[PDB]
Amino acid sequence: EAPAAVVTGAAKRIGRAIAVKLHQTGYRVVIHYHNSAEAAVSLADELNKERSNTAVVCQADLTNSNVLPASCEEIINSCFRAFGRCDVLVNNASAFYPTPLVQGKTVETQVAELIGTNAIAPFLLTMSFAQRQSSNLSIVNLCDAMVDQPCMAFSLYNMGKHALVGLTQSAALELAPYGIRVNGVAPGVSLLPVAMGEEEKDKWRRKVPLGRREASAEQIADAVIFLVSGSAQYITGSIIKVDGGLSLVHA
Amino acid sequence: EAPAAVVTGAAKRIGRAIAVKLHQTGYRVVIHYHNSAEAAVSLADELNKERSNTAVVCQADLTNSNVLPASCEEIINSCFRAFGRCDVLVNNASAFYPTPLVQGKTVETQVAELIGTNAIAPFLLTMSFAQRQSSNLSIVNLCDAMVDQPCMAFSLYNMGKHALVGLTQSAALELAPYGIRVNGVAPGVSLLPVAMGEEEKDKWRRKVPLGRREASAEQIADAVIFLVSGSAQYITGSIIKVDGGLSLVHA
Amino acid sequence: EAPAAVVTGAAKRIGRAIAVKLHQTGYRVVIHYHNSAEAAVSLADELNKERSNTAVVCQADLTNSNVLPASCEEIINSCFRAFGRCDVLVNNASAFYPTPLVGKTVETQVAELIGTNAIAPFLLTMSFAQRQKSSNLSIVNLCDAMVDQPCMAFSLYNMGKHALVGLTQSAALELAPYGIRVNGVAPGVSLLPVAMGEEEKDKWRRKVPLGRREASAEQIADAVIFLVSGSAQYITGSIIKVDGGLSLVHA
Amino acid sequence: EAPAAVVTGAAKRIGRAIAVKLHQTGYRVVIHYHNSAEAAVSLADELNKERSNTAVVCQADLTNSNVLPASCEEIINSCFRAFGRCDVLVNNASAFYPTPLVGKTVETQVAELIGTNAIAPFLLTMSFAQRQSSNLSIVNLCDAMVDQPCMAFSLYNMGKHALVGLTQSAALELAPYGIRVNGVAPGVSLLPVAMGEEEKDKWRRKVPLGRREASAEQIADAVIFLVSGSAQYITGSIIKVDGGLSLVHA
Ligand SMILES: NC(=O)c1ccc[n+]([C@@H]2O[C@H](COP(=O)([O-])OP(=O)(O)OC[C@H]3O[C@@H](n4cnc5c(N)ncnc54)[C@H](OP(=O)(O)O)[C@@H]3O)[C@@H](O)[C@H]2O)c1
Ligand SMILES: NC(=O)c1ccc[n+]([C@@H]2O[C@H](COP(=O)([O-])OP(=O)(O)OC[C@H]3O[C@@H](n4cnc5c(N)ncnc54)[C@H](OP(=O)(O)O)[C@@H]3O)[C@@H](O)[C@H]2O)c1
Ligand SMILES: NC(=O)c1ccc[n+]([C@@H]2O[C@H](COP(=O)([O-])OP(=O)(O)OC[C@H]3O[C@@H](n4cnc5c(N)ncnc54)[C@H](OP(=O)(O)O)[C@@H]3O)[C@@H](O)[C@H]2O)c1
Ligand SMILES: NC(=O)c1ccc[n+]([C@@H]2O[C@H](COP(=O)([O-])OP(=O)(O)OC[C@H]3O[C@@H](n4cnc5c(N)ncnc54)[C@H](OP(=O)(O)O)[C@@H]3O)[C@@H](O)[C@H]2O)c1
Ligand SMILES: Nc1nc(N)c2c(-c3ccc(F)cc3)cnc-2[nH]1
Ligand SMILES: Nc1nc(N)c2c(-c3ccc(F)cc3)cnc-2[nH]1
Ligand SMILES: Nc1nc(N)c2c(-c3ccc(F)cc3)cnc-2[nH]1
Ligand SMILES: Nc1nc(N)c2c(-c3ccc(F)cc3)cnc-2[nH]1
């Protein structure tokens, strides 16, 4: 049968691009989403029109809480319930906003969302994925090429993405005896936030040596597809920057 | 007016050495503890014998929870109460134990303790330290030289220490305009766990190129003292390995 | 028109596998060799049997000397003379042997180890770029996953490979305006030396988390093919580890 | 008896401040220089006026060539000749200029930039180790911007990367002899002699910590730490002294 993949935060933007590319490659997909129900259902509809019974949606909040482990177990279970297997996990869902150190949400809510989505949920999903297991099993974590030259006032987000690098390495080591590879893809500037005005987008665009433009969602998805493929069967613990040289540019 | 320092987890082992060496350098010190009340007090007694009213203690659990931000505010407050200023924060307190990915603390308790002590508490203490502020202000975070070659089955602990590296860099960037430096000290093998088998201890000792032995607590403290000193006033965002070459040794 | 690639040290082992996969993908190839003339010719004849006039050989010593710049220019010029174009350069040729700190003179060792692993790649990169100034131009440098946990007594080899990482980053930045991408592939343990006893090969194989085996030459080649492909069009300055997790394993 | 240190490129700027600071700490010093003879001799005069017989100069070209090993052996030998011992080596001398990929030959640029920044440190390390209570160590002056390099400085960057590799390899291999090997990595410190207020202030405003360059003395302070008894478990470590520069995105 066809293999099956879970993509977190897959309703739009880079997560959609990944789910679409996995689907085009032959995977059945679980489209996880949090708030973007209409978009997630519209995506599953398109994929199922292309090949019937190959896409399902799965709603979950990935904020840290005492029930997050159950939520993550349920996401993996949703892939087994729909498709009878789960070959690939892509940890894409991410909260992203500033948390200034010196002066809406309480700080503990900010911790829970920013560390939950970027690090704890990937950890719990990785535990569940491994516990439920020819084969080409792997996990791909969406990291950040700018983790060591971070945006000002984004400490909790940056902490979250560092922890995710840690996870990628720890889980690669620990899951290797089970034949589960664990890798990352690290965008620099890809799709800019929808709220950002064009002038500010262009400022970011002009920082990128390779073409003075952001990565397309497809360009990010391409590196994901490589890492899940048979062409990466000896690669584990590796994080591939997809940044057009941005991380190499000094202040 | 002598400067004042907060050292978390300062009752025993490396935290104690750091507190002692800061005191010997002329600092007044807050000795934070969780369970080691008798030891913390015994340390403060020894230090106040040398110099009267230059050491106090402060109890707090640094597990993440709804009350952690208040507990961290009060640690910083205890330094301002006792001494009228707070020049140095040392984030040393740390939970450490395995959290295997594949199979009586629940996983979310493990998250709260390992991520709370190694990363969230340092973030919250950093916030409180900064908000409450010629001077030589700095923060020193106790990291881990082996973050990129982690111990097997220590994912959460490793995620915690990676997040602490992220905080070190983010806070160095953001707090530099206030003259607050933020740095790290990364031990390799220092004081081995009290519980560990003596023959296990020697296996780790034999791995160290420089001397085939662990670092003393004083050797770790030595790097801390350098970082807080006037001879490090241009250093921020730096993490100093104190590992006798261990991290350079291949498998 | 079919694109063309230069592969240095392509007669045997990993370089051979790279040349073969590039050819299978549709490239015309220049097979550079130093001493392995019979193997190089055997490869060219095998490839030209598949498609006539698609493989040539080129001989050169890549040891550093007064004539190295000329030799590197000529290698690049051979691709243009043979094929009318040069789209891809793979810097694969490498001297490798110990140089302890405590019959070749030391300056010969410097010339060979730094020449092949670093200087020749730099001069080849200059010549490649000078001859340029639809298309997908890129350079791929064969690096080493173990560069930060080096083999004992291999200082000059390790220096060479570090210089090569530096060149990969510097050239990525500088050549990005010309649309030339520059990346690396970093093996850990791949094909072990031919004369090495199996019992010694096994000590290395047993260190690899993912399968307790070395990478095949084709597995290394797969990563090269990705980097040169249309699926890596935003990737520059990136070094892909292909190491089965070896570099994450502590001593 | 006083320990002794070799400092390469010690006539001016950062190397000079390192030599002065080691001397203040109690070391006898060899002041290596290439072209700065007057500044070198002037410095040794100053130092020897403070404590007699505690500074010598030693001239050498550290460009790579078939005689570089001899020149490097001679630098180390000069320390033993003057002082009967060699406790510390500081690899500070460095050529620095652009080598774009697209009136010196390219092989001269390779020789100078890779020689001074990497090969000479390697040969000096070999000679130092072969000639060997004690606290023996080597400190290499690296570069905090090695992973965000200046445009068109490929050979220089290659040199400094190779110097990181040397720092790690030599730390590993020399640990069984008790020789520690470490680095200090400036970001922006004393700006080039040829550079205007606009361009100097351009670099200054990039630095988070004070919007200024490091003083030479601030770089020397980290060197002093690493050679000290307070760093006896530290080997293979590189200390950035950059005021946060390397943390700032494009
Ligand atoms: N875009 C870039 O330039 C860039 C740069 C560096 C790294 N990255 C990384 O690449 C990945 C994709 O980036 P992106 O810009 O496409 O992401 P994004 O649009 O910011 O977020 C992707 C999805 O994350 C999900 N999410 C957010 N909070 C959540 C929560 N509490 N629970 C569950 N899901 C939640 C949302 O799902 P709903 O919409 O369903 O609510 C959202 O669509 C992320 O991991 C990101 O950090 C992106
Ligand atoms: N020892 C090593 O070889 C080594 C190696 C690498 C890194 N490090 C790092 O260096 C630092 C010191 O190491 P160490 O071995 O001295 O540490 P440790 O003995 O494991 O722990 C230090 C203190 O942390 C405090 N702590 C633990 N859980 C806590 C909680 N939930 N709330 C508040 N405080 C808590 C404890 O205080 P109470 O006793 O008062 O409960 C404990 O005494 C740590 O950050 C560690 O990760 C050490
Ligand atoms: N095999 C591994 O496990 C491993 C591990 C880490 C990194 N790598 C890297 O991957 C690449 C390929 O590895 P490999 O094991 O296949 O390499 P290799 O067999 O050791 O060397 C490849 C070729 O390098 C050429 N070469 C050597 N000295 C030369 C000189 N002075 N001038 C010109 N060419 C010279 C030789 O060509 P002739 O035979 O024609 O003389 C040789 O066949 C190298 O860059 C290597 O450092 C390999
Ligand atoms: N200044 C900074 O901002 C900065 C930033 C990053 C890294 N660094 C590193 O810190 C160290 C000192 O920096 P600096 O700016 O003080 O250095 P510098 O003034 O550029 O150079 C120091 C000395 O190196 C010597 N030198 C140059 N070419 C030589 C050769 N062929 N043979 C022998 N010696 C040679 C020169 O000696 P003579 O004058 O006697 O000819 C020169 O005085 C260097 O390793 C540098 O790369 C500095
Ligand atoms: N979840 C998530 N969404 C994002 N838009 C980002 C970005 C990003 C990167 C560049 C930019 F100008 C704005 C945001 C960086 N990291 C992100 N993570
Ligand atoms: N908080 C804390 N306590 C510790 N004992 C450690 C160690 C450590 C390091 C080496 C070893 F053999 C056992 C434990 C590593 N990291 C630690 N963190
Ligand atoms: N040019 C070149 N050839 C090689 N055989 C190597 C190796 C390698 C890696 C493992 C081993 F046991 C022996 C050599 C590591 N790096 C290399 N480079
Ligand atoms: N030998 C040597 N000399 C230097 N002046 C440098 C610098 C440097 C750093 C900043 C700047 F604006 C100009 C030069 C960076 N690296 C150097 N190396």
Side-chain angles (χ1 to χ4, degrees), chain D residues 133-151:
Chain D
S133 299
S134 71
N135 181 15
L136 304 174
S137 81
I138 302 177
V139 185
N140 293 329
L141 277 281
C142 300
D143 188 335
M145 303 303 292
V146 78
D147 295 314
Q148 294 129 101
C150 285
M151 180 61 74

PDB file of all heavy atoms in Angstrom, chain D residues 133-151:
ATOM      1  N   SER D 133      53.390  21.444  38.757  1.00  0.00           N
ATOM      2  CA  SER D 133      54.195  22.664  38.670  1.00  0.00           C
ATOM      3  C   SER D 133      53.962  23.491  37.379  1.00  0.00           C
ATOM      4  O   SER D 133      53.359  24.578  37.431  1.00  0.00           O
ATOM      5  CB  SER D 133      55.677  22.313  38.829  1.00  0.00           C
ATOM      6  OG  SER D 133      55.904  21.716  40.094  1.00  0.00           O
ATOM      7  N   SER D 134      54.424  22.988  36.231  1.00  0.00           N
ATOM      8  CA  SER D 134      54.316  23.731  34.965  1.00  0.00           C
ATOM      9  C   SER D 134      52.853  23.996  34.555  1.00  0.00           C
ATOM     10  O   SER D 134      51.932  23.310  34.983  1.00  0.00           O
ATOM     11  CB  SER D 134      55.040  22.984  33.848  1.00  0.00           C
ATOM     12  OG  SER D 134      54.336  21.807  33.489  1.00  0.00           O
ATOM     13  N   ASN D 135      52.638  25.047  33.783  1.00  0.00           N
ATOM     14  CA  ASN D 135      51.313  25.304  33.228  1.00  0.00           C
ATOM     15  C   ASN D 135      51.514  25.717  31.777  1.00  0.00           C
ATOM     16  O   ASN D 135      51.569  26.916  31.452  1.00  0.00           O
ATOM     17  CB  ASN D 135      50.581  26.394  34.010  1.00  0.00           C
ATOM     18  CG  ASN D 135      49.185  26.666  33.466  1.00  0.00           C
ATOM     19  OD1 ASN D 135      48.625  25.879  32.680  1.00  0.00           O
ATOM     20  ND2 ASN D 135      48.614  27.789  33.880  1.00  0.00           N
ATOM     21  N   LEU D 136      51.669  24.705  30.940  1.00  0.00           N
ATOM     22  CA  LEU D 136      52.004  24.901  29.525  1.00  0.00           C
ATOM     23  C   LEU D 136      50.736  25.146  28.718  1.00  0.00           C
ATOM     24  O   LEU D 136      49.786  24.406  28.820  1.00  0.00           O
ATOM     25  CB  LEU D 136      52.725  23.673  28.989  1.00  0.00           C
ATOM     26  CG  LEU D 136      53.989  23.246  29.727  1.00  0.00           C
ATOM     27  CD1 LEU D 136      54.449  21.938  29.115  1.00  0.00           C
ATOM     28  CD2 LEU D 136      55.050  24.317  29.649  1.00  0.00           C
ATOM     29  N   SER D 137      50.700  26.201  27.929  1.00  0.00           N
ATOM     30  CA  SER D 137      49.540  26.351  27.043  1.00  0.00           C
ATOM     31  C   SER D 137      49.807  27.209  25.810  1.00  0.00           C
ATOM     32  O   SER D 137      50.792  27.967  25.723  1.00  0.00           O
ATOM     33  CB  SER D 137      48.297  26.843  27.800  1.00  0.00           C
ATOM     34  OG  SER D 137      48.307  28.251  27.996  1.00  0.00           O
ATOM     35  N   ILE D 138      48.926  27.011  24.835  1.00  0.00           N
ATOM     36  CA  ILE D 138      48.916  27.744  23.571  1.00  0.00           C
ATOM     37  C   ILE D 138      47.590  28.459  23.437  1.00  0.00           C
ATOM     38  O   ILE D 138      46.534  27.903  23.731  1.00  0.00           O
ATOM     39  CB  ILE D 138      49.104  26.762  22.394  1.00  0.00           C
ATOM     40  CG1 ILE D 138      50.422  25.966  22.556  1.00  0.00           C
ATOM     41  CG2 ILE D 138      49.086  27.447  21.049  1.00  0.00           C
ATOM     42  CD1 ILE D 138      50.636  24.935  21.478  1.00  0.00           C
ATOM     43  N   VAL D 139      47.642  29.709  22.990  1.00  0.00           N
ATOM     44  CA  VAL D 139      46.442  30.481  22.685  1.00  0.00           C
ATOM     45  C   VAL D 139      46.539  30.986  21.245  1.00  0.00           C
ATOM     46  O   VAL D 139      47.501  31.607  20.879  1.00  0.00           O
ATOM     47  CB  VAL D 139      46.226  31.700  23.633  1.00  0.00           C
ATOM     48  CG1 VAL D 139      44.888  32.357  23.295  1.00  0.00           C
ATOM     49  CG2 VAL D 139      46.271  31.262  25.080  1.00  0.00           C
ATOM     50  N   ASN D 140      45.550  30.645  20.432  1.00  0.00           N
ATOM     51  CA  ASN D 140      45.424  31.050  19.043  1.00  0.00           C
ATOM     52  C   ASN D 140      44.411  32.163  18.874  1.00  0.00           C
ATOM     53  O   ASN D 140      43.276  32.042  19.361  1.00  0.00           O
ATOM     54  CB  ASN D 140      44.999  29.803  18.240  1.00  0.00           C
ATOM     55  CG  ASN D 140      46.100  28.759  18.214  1.00  0.00           C
ATOM     56  OD1 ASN D 140      47.290  29.109  18.256  1.00  0.00           O
ATOM     57  ND2 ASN D 140      45.735  27.500  18.206  1.00  0.00           N
ATOM     58  N   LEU D 141      44.787  33.237  18.182  1.00  0.00           N
ATOM     59  CA  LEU D 141      43.851  34.337  17.919  1.00  0.00           C
ATOM     60  C   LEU D 141      43.046  33.979  16.679  1.00  0.00           C
ATOM     61  O   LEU D 141      43.578  33.882  15.579  1.00  0.00           O
ATOM     62  CB  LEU D 141      44.575  35.670  17.724  1.00  0.00           C
ATOM     63  CG  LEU D 141      44.914  36.355  19.050  1.00  0.00           C
ATOM     64  CD1 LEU D 141      43.703  37.055  19.648  1.00  0.00           C
ATOM     65  CD2 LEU D 141      45.546  35.362  20.034  1.00  0.00           C
ATOM     66  N   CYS D 142      41.776  33.701  16.912  1.00  0.00           N
ATOM     67  CA  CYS D 142      40.870  33.246  15.888  1.00  0.00           C
ATOM     68  C   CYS D 142      40.027  34.449  15.439  1.00  0.00           C
ATOM     69  O   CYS D 142      40.563  35.568  15.395  1.00  0.00           O
ATOM     70  CB  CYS D 142      40.029  32.117  16.397  1.00  0.00           C
ATOM     71  SG  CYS D 142      41.058  30.687  16.911  1.00  0.00           S
ATOM     72  N   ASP D 143      38.758  34.220  15.088  1.00  0.00           N
ATOM     73  CA  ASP D 143      37.878  35.317  14.588  1.00  0.00           C
ATOM     74  C   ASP D 143      36.445  34.946  14.891  1.00  0.00           C
ATOM     75  O   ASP D 143      35.986  33.868  14.499  1.00  0.00           O
ATOM     76  CB  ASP D 143      38.139  35.519  13.109  1.00  0.00           C
ATOM     77  CG  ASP D 143      37.438  36.748  12.529  1.00  0.00           C
ATOM     78  OD1 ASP D 143      36.402  37.209  13.056  1.00  0.00           O
ATOM     79  OD2 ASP D 143      37.952  37.230  11.508  1.00  0.00           O
ATOM     80  N   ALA D 144      35.755  35.803  15.652  1.00  0.00           N
ATOM     81  CA  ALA D 144      34.367  35.548  16.042  1.00  0.00           C
ATOM     82  C   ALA D 144      33.407  35.507  14.841  1.00  0.00           C
ATOM     83  O   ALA D 144      32.353  34.883  14.925  1.00  0.00           O
ATOM     84  CB  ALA D 144      33.876  36.563  17.062  1.00  0.00           C
ATOM     85  N   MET D 145      33.788  36.145  13.735  1.00  0.00           N
ATOM     86  CA  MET D 145      32.969  36.203  12.513  1.00  0.00           C
ATOM     87  C   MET D 145      33.273  35.109  11.462  1.00  0.00           C
ATOM     88  O   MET D 145      32.839  35.143  10.324  1.00  0.00           O
ATOM     89  CB  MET D 145      33.081  37.629  11.931  1.00  0.00           C
ATOM     90  CG  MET D 145      32.640  38.670  12.957  1.00  0.00           C
ATOM     91  SD  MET D 145      30.954  38.439  13.581  1.00  0.00           S
ATOM     92  CE  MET D 145      29.981  38.820  12.110  1.00  0.00           C
ATOM     93  N   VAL D 146      33.931  34.052  11.895  1.00  0.00           N
ATOM     94  CA  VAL D 146      34.398  33.005  10.980  1.00  0.00           C
ATOM     95  C   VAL D 146      33.238  32.324  10.215  1.00  0.00           C
ATOM     96  O   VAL D 146      33.421  31.900   9.050  1.00  0.00           O
ATOM     97  CB  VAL D 146      35.305  32.036  11.802  1.00  0.00           C
ATOM     98  CG1 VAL D 146      34.479  31.101  12.622  1.00  0.00           C
ATOM     99  CG2 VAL D 146      36.293  31.334  10.932  1.00  0.00           C
ATOM    100  N   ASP D 147      32.046  32.287  10.808  1.00  0.00           N
ATOM    101  CA  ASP D 147      30.866  31.778  10.098  1.00  0.00           C
ATOM    102  C   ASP D 147      29.936  32.832   9.473  1.00  0.00           C
ATOM    103  O   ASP D 147      28.892  32.478   8.910  1.00  0.00           O
ATOM    104  CB  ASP D 147      30.088  30.833  10.989  1.00  0.00           C
ATOM    105  CG  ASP D 147      30.890  29.576  11.321  1.00  0.00           C
ATOM    106  OD1 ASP D 147      31.509  28.944  10.436  1.00  0.00           O
ATOM    107  OD2 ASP D 147      30.911  29.233  12.501  1.00  0.00           O
ATOM    108  N   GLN D 148      30.327  34.096   9.547  1.00  0.00           N
ATOM    109  CA  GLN D 148      29.642  35.194   8.845  1.00  0.00           C
ATOM    110  C   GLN D 148      30.738  36.080   8.239  1.00  0.00           C
ATOM    111  O   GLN D 148      30.966  37.229   8.669  1.00  0.00           O
ATOM    112  CB  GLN D 148      28.787  35.997   9.807  1.00  0.00           C
ATOM    113  CG  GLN D 148      27.605  35.257  10.410  1.00  0.00           C
ATOM    114  CD  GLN D 148      27.593  35.401  11.903  1.00  0.00           C
ATOM    115  OE1 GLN D 148      26.833  36.200  12.463  1.00  0.00           O
ATOM    116  NE2 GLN D 148      28.456  34.667  12.561  1.00  0.00           N
ATOM    117  N   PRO D 149      31.454  35.534   7.261  1.00  0.00           N
ATOM    118  CA  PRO D 149      32.703  36.153   6.860  1.00  0.00           C
ATOM    119  C   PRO D 149      32.515  37.449   6.037  1.00  0.00           C
ATOM    120  O   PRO D 149      31.464  37.665   5.424  1.00  0.00           O
ATOM    121  CB  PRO D 149      33.332  35.097   5.990  1.00  0.00           C
ATOM    122  CG  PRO D 149      32.201  34.381   5.388  1.00  0.00           C
ATOM    123  CD  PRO D 149      31.176  34.314   6.495  1.00  0.00           C
ATOM    124  N   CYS D 150      33.553  38.268   6.030  1.00  0.00           N
ATOM    125  CA  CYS D 150      33.595  39.457   5.182  1.00  0.00           C
ATOM    126  C   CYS D 150      33.630  39.037   3.725  1.00  0.00           C
ATOM    127  O   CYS D 150      34.268  38.075   3.353  1.00  0.00           O
ATOM    128  CB  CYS D 150      34.817  40.309   5.529  1.00  0.00           C
ATOM    129  SG  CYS D 150      34.641  41.229   7.081  1.00  0.00           S
ATOM    130  N   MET D 151      32.930  39.794   2.892  1.00  0.00           N
ATOM    131  CA  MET D 151      32.858  39.560   1.481  1.00  0.00           C
ATOM    132  C   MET D 151      34.230  39.642   0.814  1.00  0.00           C
ATOM    133  O   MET D 151      34.947  40.584   1.029  1.00  0.00           O
ATOM    134  CB  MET D 151      31.953  40.665   0.887  1.00  0.00           C
ATOM    135  CG  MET D 151      31.768  40.582  -0.605  1.00  0.00           C
ATOM    136  SD  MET D 151      30.993  39.043  -1.072  1.00  0.00           S
ATOM    137  CE  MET D 151      29.300  39.262  -0.572  1.00  0.00           C
TER     138      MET D 151
END
